[PDB]
Each structure stands twice: as structure tokens, then as C-alpha cells.
Short mmCIF file of C-alpha atoms in Angstrom, two decimals:
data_model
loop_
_atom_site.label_atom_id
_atom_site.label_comp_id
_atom_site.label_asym_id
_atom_site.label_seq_id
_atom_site.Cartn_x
_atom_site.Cartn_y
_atom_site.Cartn_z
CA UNK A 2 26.79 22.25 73.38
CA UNK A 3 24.91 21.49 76.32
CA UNK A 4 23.68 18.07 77.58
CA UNK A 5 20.66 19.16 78.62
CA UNK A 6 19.88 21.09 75.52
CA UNK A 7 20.50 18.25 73.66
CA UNK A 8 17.99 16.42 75.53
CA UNK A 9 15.46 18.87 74.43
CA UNK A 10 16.85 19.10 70.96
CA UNK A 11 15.94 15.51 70.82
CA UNK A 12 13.60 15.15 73.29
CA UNK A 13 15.17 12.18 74.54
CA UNK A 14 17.08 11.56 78.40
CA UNK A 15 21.04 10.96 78.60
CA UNK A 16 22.90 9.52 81.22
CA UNK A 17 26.89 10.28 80.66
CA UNK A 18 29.51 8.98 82.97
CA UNK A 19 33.06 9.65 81.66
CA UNK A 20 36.39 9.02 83.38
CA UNK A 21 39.97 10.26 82.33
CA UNK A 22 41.88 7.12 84.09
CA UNK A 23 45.07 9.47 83.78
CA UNK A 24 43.46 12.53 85.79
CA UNK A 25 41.29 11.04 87.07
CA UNK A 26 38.24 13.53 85.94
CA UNK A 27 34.94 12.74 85.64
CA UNK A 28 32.25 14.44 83.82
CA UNK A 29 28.96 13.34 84.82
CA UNK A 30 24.70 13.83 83.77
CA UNK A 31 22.11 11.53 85.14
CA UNK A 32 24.59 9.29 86.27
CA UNK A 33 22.63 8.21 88.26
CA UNK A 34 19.57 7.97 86.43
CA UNK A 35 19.01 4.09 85.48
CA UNK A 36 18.99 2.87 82.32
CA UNK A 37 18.63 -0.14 80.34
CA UNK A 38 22.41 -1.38 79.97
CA UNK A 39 21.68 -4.13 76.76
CA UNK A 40 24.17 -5.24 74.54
CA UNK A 41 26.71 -3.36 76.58
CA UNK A 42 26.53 -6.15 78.97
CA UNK A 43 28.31 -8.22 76.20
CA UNK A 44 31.71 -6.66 77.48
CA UNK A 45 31.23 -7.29 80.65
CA UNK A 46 30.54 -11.01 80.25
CA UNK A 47 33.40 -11.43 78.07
CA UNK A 48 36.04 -9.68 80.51
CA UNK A 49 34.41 -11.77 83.48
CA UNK A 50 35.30 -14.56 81.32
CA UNK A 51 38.96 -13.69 80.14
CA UNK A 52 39.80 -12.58 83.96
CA UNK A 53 39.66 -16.44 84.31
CA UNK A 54 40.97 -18.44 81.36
CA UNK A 55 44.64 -17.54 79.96
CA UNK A 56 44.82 -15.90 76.09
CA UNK A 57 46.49 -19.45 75.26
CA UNK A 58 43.81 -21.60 76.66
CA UNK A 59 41.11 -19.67 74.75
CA UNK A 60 41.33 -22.33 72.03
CA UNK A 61 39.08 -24.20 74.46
CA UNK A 62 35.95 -25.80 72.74
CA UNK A 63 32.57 -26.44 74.05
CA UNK A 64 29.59 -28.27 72.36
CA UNK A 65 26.78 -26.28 70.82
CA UNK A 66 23.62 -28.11 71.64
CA UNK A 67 20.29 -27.25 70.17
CA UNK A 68 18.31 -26.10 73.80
CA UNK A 69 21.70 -23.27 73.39
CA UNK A 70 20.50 -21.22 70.53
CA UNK A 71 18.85 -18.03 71.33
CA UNK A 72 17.29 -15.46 68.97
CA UNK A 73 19.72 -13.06 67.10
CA UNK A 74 22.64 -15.18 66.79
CA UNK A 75 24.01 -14.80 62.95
CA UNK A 76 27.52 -16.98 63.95
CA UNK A 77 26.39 -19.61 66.84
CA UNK A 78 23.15 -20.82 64.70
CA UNK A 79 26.02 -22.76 62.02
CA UNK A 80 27.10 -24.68 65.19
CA UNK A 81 24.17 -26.16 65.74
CA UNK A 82 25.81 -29.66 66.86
CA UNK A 83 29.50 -28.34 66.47
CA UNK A 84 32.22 -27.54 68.67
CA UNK A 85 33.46 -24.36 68.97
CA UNK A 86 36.30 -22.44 70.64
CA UNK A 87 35.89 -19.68 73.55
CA UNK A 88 38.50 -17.30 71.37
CA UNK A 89 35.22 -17.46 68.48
CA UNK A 90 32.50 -17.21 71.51
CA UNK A 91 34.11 -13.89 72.36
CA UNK A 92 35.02 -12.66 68.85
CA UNK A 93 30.89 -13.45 67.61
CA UNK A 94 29.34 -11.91 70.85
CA UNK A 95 31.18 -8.80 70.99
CA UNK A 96 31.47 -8.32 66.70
CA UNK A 97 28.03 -9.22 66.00
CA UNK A 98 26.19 -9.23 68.63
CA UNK A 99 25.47 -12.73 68.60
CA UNK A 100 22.68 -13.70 71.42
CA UNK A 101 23.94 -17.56 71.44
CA UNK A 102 27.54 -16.60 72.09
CA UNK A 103 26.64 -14.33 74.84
CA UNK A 104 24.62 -16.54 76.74
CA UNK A 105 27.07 -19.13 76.51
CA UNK A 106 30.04 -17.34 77.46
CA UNK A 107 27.78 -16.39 80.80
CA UNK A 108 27.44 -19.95 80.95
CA UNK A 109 31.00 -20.41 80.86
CA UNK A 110 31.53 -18.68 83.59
CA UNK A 111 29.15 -20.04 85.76
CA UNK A 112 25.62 -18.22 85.62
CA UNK A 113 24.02 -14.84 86.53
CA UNK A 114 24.71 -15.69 90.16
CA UNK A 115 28.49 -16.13 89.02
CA UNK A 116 28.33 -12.91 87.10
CA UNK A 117 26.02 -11.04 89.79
CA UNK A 118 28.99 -12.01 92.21
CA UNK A 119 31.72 -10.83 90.19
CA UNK A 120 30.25 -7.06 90.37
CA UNK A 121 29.33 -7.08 93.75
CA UNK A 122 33.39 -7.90 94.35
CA UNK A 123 33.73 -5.14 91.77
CA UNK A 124 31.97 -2.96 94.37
CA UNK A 125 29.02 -2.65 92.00
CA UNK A 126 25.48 -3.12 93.73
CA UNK A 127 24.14 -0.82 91.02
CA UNK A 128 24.23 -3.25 87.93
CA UNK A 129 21.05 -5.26 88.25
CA UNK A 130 21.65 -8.12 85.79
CA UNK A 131 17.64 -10.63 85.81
CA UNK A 132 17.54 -11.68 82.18
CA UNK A 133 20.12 -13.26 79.90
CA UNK A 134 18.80 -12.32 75.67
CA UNK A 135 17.28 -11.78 73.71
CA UNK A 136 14.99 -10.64 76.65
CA UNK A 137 17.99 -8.34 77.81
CA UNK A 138 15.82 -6.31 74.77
CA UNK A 139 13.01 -5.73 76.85
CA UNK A 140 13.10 -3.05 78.81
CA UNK A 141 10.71 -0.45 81.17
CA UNK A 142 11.07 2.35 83.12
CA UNK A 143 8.65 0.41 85.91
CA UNK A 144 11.84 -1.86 86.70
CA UNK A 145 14.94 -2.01 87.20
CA UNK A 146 15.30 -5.34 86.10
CA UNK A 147 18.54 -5.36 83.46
CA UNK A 148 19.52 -1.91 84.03
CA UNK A 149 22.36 0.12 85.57
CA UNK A 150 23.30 3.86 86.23
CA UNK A 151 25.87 5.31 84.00
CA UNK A 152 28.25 6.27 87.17
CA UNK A 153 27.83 2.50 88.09
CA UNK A 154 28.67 0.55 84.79
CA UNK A 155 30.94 3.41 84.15
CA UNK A 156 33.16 2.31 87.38
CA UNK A 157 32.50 -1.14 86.82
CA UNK A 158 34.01 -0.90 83.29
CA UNK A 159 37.00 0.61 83.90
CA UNK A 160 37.70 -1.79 87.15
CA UNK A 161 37.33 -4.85 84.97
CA UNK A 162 39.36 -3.92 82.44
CA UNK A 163 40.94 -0.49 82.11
CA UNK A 164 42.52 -1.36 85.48
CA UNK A 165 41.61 -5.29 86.79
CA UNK A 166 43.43 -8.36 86.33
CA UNK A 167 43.43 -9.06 82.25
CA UNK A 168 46.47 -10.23 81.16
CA UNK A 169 48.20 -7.81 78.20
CA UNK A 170 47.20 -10.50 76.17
CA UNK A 171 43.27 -10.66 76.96
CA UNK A 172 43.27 -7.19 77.19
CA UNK A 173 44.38 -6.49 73.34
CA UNK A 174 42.19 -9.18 72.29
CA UNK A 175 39.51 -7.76 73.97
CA UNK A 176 40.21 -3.82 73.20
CA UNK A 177 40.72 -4.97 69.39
CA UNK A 178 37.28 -6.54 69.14
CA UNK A 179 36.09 -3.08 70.41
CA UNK A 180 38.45 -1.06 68.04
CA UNK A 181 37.36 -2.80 64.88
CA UNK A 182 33.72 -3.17 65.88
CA UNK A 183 31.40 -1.52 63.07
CA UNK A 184 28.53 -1.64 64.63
CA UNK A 185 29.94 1.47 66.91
CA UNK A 186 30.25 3.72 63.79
CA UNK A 187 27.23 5.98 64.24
CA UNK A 188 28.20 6.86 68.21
CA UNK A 189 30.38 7.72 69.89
CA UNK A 190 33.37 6.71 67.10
CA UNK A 191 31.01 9.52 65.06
CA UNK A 192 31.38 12.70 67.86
CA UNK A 193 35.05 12.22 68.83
CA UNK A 194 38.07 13.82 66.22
CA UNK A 195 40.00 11.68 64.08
CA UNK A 196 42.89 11.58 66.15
CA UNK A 197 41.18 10.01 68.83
CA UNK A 198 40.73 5.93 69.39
CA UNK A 199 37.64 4.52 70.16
CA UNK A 200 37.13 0.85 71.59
CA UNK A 201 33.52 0.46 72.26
CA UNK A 202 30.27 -1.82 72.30
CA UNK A 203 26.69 -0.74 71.73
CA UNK A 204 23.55 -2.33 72.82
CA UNK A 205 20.01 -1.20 72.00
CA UNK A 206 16.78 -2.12 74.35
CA UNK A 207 13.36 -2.78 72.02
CA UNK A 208 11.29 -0.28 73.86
CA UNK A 209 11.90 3.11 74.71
CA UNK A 210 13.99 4.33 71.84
CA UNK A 211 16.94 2.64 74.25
CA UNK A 212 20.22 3.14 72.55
CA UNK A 213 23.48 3.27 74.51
CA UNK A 214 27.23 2.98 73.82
CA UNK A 215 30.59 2.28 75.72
CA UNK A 216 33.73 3.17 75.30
CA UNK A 217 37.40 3.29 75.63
CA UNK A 218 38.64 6.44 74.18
CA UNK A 219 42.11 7.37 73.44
CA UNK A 220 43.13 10.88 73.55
CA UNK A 221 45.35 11.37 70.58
CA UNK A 222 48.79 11.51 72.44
CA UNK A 223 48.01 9.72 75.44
CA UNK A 224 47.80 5.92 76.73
CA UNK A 225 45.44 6.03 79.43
CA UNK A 226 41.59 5.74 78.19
CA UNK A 227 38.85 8.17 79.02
CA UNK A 228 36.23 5.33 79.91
CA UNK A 229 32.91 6.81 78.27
CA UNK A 230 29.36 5.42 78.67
CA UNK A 231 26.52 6.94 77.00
CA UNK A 232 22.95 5.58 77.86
CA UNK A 233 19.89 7.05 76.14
CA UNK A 234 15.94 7.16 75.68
CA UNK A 235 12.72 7.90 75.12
CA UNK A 236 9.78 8.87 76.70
CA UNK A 237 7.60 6.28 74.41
CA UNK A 238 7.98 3.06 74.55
CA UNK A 239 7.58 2.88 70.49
CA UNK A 240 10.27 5.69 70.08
CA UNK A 241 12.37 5.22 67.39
CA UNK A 242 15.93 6.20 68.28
CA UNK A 243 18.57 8.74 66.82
CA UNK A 244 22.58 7.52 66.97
CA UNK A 245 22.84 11.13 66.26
CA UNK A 246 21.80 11.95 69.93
CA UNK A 247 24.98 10.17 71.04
CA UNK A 248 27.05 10.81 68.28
CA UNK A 249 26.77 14.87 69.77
CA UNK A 250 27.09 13.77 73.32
CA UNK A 251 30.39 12.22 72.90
CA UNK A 252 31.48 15.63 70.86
CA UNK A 253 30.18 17.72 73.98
CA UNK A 254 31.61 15.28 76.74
CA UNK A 255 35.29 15.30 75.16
CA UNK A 256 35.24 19.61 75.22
CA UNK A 257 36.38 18.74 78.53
CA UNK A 258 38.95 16.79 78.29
#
């Protein structure tokens, strides 16, 4: 099916950068159209963060203070006061979202100016991280503040960790967190085939109908990932979104590969 007709079936905008590391194809639509990047930002954090710390010093602990807790954070608001190890930051930010986690991890790491740094190295001056959560919900077509191009986070993704410097080690940790990840069920995991493997991380804006999804997608009988990103939205800020929209544009984008 057509991208664009799928746009008009559901009246919403797509943005589809896809990347067949073997190959090295690339299908592209509105790459370059910016988007609001939102939860998907929770992968990049926490590959920034394993590029620097070894798999066997992830049972590293840092102090959850009060002033840390951020809205949406269903595992970090029980350590409240508690300790807790890097290996469960990761493991809550990128399996339930959790805001707390997320923010810390960037914190481990040093800061938006850290993490800003880290993608400019990456060769990305498209990424524009402002905000940290839950503001990273917020989002408007006025600015540009906390959003990307699909082309852009596409690249940046598959530098960081399809090819980048994560250990095996990191890298299964991290992939696994994406492969078991049910939040993911309704996208892109719904439009591939069943012989396929899908390692990805959503996100979701509050305004615009902005839904998006990531992905590392494994060709049944092959070992190199097509890196997928999917961004989405809405004309209104008050549009409610449709997984379905995505859920079709991953079927359409894999007809070519």
C-alpha cells in the first residue's frame, strides 16, 4: 500500500526512515519532516550510557532522592530513599517507560549537554534534545524543541548501536529489553510477519495525536537489522492517535526489503 495513501486513509503525516545495515538500502518518506521523537529518546539515553560503563559494572547503585522523581514513573517512585542499580535504571526506563529512570540515567551520564555532545560526535545536528520528561510529552509543530527527522534519529540509531562501540554484552542486554518490550505490540511488532524479529521502543507526545516507534528488525534468515523508525501525527493538537497507522506502515515499508 502506499505511504501516502495511508496518510490520507488516516489523515495523519508519517515520517519513515528504514535502513537494511546488510545492503545498505534505505527506504525513505518525510524523512526529513521533524517530528516529536518522545519516549524513543529512552534508547538513546540508555546506549549513551552503556557505551560507557562495562555489562559487569552495571550493578552500580545510585541514591534515589526525593527532588529525582518525575511524573510517570511506576518502578523509581518505590525507591523513594533507596539505592538502586544502573542494570534496573535501564531495565524500568526502557520496559515501562519509567520518567524517573530516564532522567536519571541522563543524569548518569552527565546532562543534556553530555547527551547533546554525544550526537553531535554521532554526526547528528538534527536531534534537538531541550526538555528531559515528562515535558518530553509536550510537543508543537511551532518548535523544534525535542524533535528530530526520521533520516536523522534513523542514522543516529543505528551508529549507536547497530554499529558503535557496545560491548556484545550491552548490546544483548539492551536488544532484549527491546525484544520483550510489550508496550511495542500494536506497531510495528503488529505489520511485520511472524518470522521476523522486532527490537523496538515507542514513545507518544500529548498533543498532536504524536505516536512513533523504533526498531530493530530481523529479517527471518538474516543477522543484520533493518533499523526502522516510524514517526507519526496529527493535524490537531487534541487528535487521538491510531497504532494501526503504524502497524500498516511497517507492513508497506518491509515490501521492500
Amino acid at each position: 500500500k502506499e505511504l501516502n495513501d495511508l496518510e490520507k486513509k488516516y489523515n495523519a503525516h508519517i515520517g519513515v526512515y528504514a535502513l537494511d545495515t546488510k545492503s545498505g538500502k534505505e527506504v525513505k518518506f518525510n524523512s526529513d519532516k521533524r517530528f516529536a521523537y518522545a519516549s524513543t529518546s529512552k534508547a538513546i539515553n540508555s546506549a549513551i550510557l552503556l557505551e560507557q560503563v562495562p555489562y559487569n559494572k552495571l550493578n552500580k547503585k545510585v541514591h534515589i532522592n526525593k527532588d529525582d522523581i518525575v511524573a510517570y514513573s511506576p518502578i523509581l517512585e518505590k525507591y523513594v530513599g533507596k539505592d538502586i542499580t544502573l542494570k534496573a535504571l535501564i531495565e524500568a526506563s526502557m520496559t515501562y517507560s519509567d520518567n524517573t529512570a530516564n532522567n536519571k540515567i541522563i543524569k548518569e551520564i552527565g546532562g543534556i549537554k553530555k547527551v547533546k555532545q554525544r550526537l553531535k560526535e554521532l554526526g547528528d545536528k538534527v536531534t534537538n534534545p531541550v526538555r528531559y520528561q515528562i515535558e518530553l510529552d509536550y510537543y508543537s509543530p511551532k518548535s523544534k524543541k525535542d524533535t528530530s527527522t526520521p533520516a536523522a534519529f534513523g542514522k543516529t540509531l543505528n551508529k549507536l548501536i547497530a554499529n558503535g562501540k557496545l560491548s556484545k554484552e550491552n548490546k544483548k542486554f539492551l536488544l532484549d529489553l527491546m525484544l520483550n518490550n510489550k508496550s511495542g505490540d500494536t506497531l510495528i511488532k503488529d505489520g511485520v510477519p511472524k518470522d521476523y524479529k522486532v527490537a523496538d521502543k515507542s514513545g507518544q507526545a500529548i498533543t498532536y495525536a504524536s505516536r512513533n516507534d523504533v526498531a530493530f528488525v530481523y529479517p527471518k534468515g538474516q543477522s543484520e537489522p533493518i533499523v526502522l523508525v516510524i514517526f507519526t501525527n496529527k493535524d490537531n493538537k487534541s487528535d487521538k492517535p491510531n497504532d494501526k497507522l503504524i502497524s500498516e506502515t511497517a507492513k508497506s515499508v518491509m515490501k521492500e526489503f
